[PDB]
Amino acid sequence: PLESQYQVGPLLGSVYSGIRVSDNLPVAIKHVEKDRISDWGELPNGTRVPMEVVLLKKVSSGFSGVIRLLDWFERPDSFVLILERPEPVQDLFDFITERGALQEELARSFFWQVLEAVRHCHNCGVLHRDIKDENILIDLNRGELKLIDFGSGALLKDTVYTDFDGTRVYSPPEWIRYHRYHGRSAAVWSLGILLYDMVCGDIPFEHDEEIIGGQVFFRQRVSSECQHLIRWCLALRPSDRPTFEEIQNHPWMQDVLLPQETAEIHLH
């Protein structure tokens, strides 16, 4: 019973707004065409499902800064994914478009929450592979960030990846030049792009040459500590990049606001 459990509303992006009829819970209803699925996986029930369902179930456990898969259905030519929908919400890309470069205090709270969410993915054996502002939702009342769209993700592994379908302008130079990368250091590079995006108002690189060029020009006033963290995340050599622990111990990352403080100071 698919159309009997949810009242489907309007398009959000093929993702529809919906409300769970059981308890009027706001949901997002994501449709995925079978004929367009890159990587397939298998759940415990032996069922062959898109990798996105596998990854979403692995990170679904408990509370997190990750979108929760509440349910899914299979149809003749598609899978349908029932995701939680924060309300009110705005994705981080629209938020930065509207606000310009974020005050460092707000960028620190946001970036910290993205770090916690990505650590959560890695703890659960999941590599997102498409961290970017478009894939981050802001719950505007709670001040909490939610990572979305695992459509490009993989099982986390320590060996080299030679496939990639994420966003190119967030991908690291070793992917650009040699079409290979390791998961964690590639993630860290995309987090550097993301952090620059928050404090400068847009991503630093648009072309391959800039990506592999390893030069970071700051178009906005940014503190030396924040510039240092960004430049560290965007080290050309992957082994030169900080671990997640080194990012969160960085001096710029200290004294983060709580989510609710973040909402009250910056979002209400």
């Binding site: 890309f93 970017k132 478009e134 769209d149 490009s152 966003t167 302008v169 967030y170 847009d202």
Partner: peptide, 7 residues
Amino acid sequence: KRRRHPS
């Protein structure tokens, strides 16, 4: 100009 980037 700031723009989105598909995957």
